[PDB]
Subunit: 29 residues, 3 copies
């Protein structure tokens, strides 16, 4: 259960980064 | 403590989804 | 281990709110 949560947090961190970069693109057109 | 962590992760996953949906609407809509 | 995971979640929450505000900015021009 704990390790599963950690893997989910890892996934979210990646999505985290993905959205940050996309918003940076959209900000600039 | 465990519950609090799980619920925070679940809330983040939902926010994950809501924000991506809004980004898509802004980009394409 | 636990303490590190809680720090990571708090960092994600903060990024959560930052990107939500950024998206709101973009929606309004
Ligand atoms: Zn559970
Ligand atoms: Zn671990
Ligand atoms: Zn292990
Ligand atoms: Zn920037
Ligand atoms: Zn710029
Ligand atoms: Zn705690």
């Amino acid at each position: 259960e704990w390790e599963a949560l950690e893997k989910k947090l890892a996934a979210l961190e990646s999505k985290x980064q993905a959205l940050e970069k996309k918003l940076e693109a959209l900000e600039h057109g």
